[PDB]
């Protein structure tokens, strides 16, 4: 199957530059009718920003034109987005997507997983992780407090525990830092017989924490 | 540019019911016997998925309960029988001309029966208290509908301005929501009081539920 894997997202200064990459596998980049970048600001809709067709012709949304460049490297089966003079309005999840040879071309059947670009002068900060200790069904969890930028990921018992897990959307605190929590409900009887560890990863700050949550 | 307006902006429908979403374009998207309107489904944390292209064609691998109709400026996406996994935002998108533009989106959730939350309260950890801050967390688990009221009380005194809430997406396993409320205090403030309580009001509760603890 075709897979689009994006990379290059991160935190960048206002006025700075970003370069995103989309590595295509299971498919030859030279066979696509067009390759595209489409972005989604937090909580908002979708905005197409750039395209390159099989014959190398490029096209850009005037909303960004003048500070955006799309290109291809056929030998690495990869295409790229370069953006400069970045503004806060450029903070978004950036998706890559393939267009079609048929039915007007400019609908998108295949998408990458998305990569977040945050335009800000605020510093990277890793979270602290605190247990939410359990008091028929008990609840326990982990509080992941004061980090920047997004995202953090949380798993339980290295992915072995998924039933009853709820990981909450991060909330932006007045301080400008994020916090979120992850909780799980389990049988009260299991609290003696079972280990509960929350695995937290904040890749932007190199912060990896495994926190054992006990009564 | 071609502007696209979807209706409604959000909807709640009972499981299995028919759902209709419309898109109106500011110019015709017709070209040579086709209409270049497309529809996508976007689930939380995921990329959009193409459902319908050229107004009425079902994208390979998409369930047949999704269908599209319309022409010129007026288009409809129909889900013939809404399933629990169909919680998502749905987008229309014209491909007649660059810039290819998307509608603003229509959020869809499943209207299940009322379910009261299970409520849990968590004190700050001792580890956190070493840092000079205390977070108290109230969890409302697996409830419907999404609207709920959480009130913090410290030594019976009602709190305002010092808590924040977060809500999950609808869980397709049982069409419920969960919610957290976090009360934040300085350590010195936390140590000045004894009784910490969160009081919960919800359609499924005939009277409010309070969960509390005494510091110590």
Numbering used by the authors:
A (entry chain H): 1 to 135, 142 to 221
B (entry chain L): 1 to 216
The article reads:
Immunoglobulin E (IgE) plays a central role in the allergic response, in which cross-linking of allergen by Fc∊RI-bound IgE triggers mast cell and basophil degranulation and the release of inflammatory mediators. Omalizumab is a clinically approved anti-IgE monoclonal antibody that binds to free IgE, also with high affinity, preventing its interaction with Fc∊RI. Instead, the Fab alone selectively crystallized in different crystal forms, but their structures revealed intermolecular Fab/Fab interactions that were clearly strong enough to disrupt the Fab/IgE-Fc complexes. Mutations were therefore designed to disrupt two recurring packing interactions observed in the omalizumab Fab crystal structures without interfering with the ability of the omalizumab Fab to recognize IgE-Fc; this led to the successful crystallization and subsequent structure determination of the Fab/IgE-Fc complex.
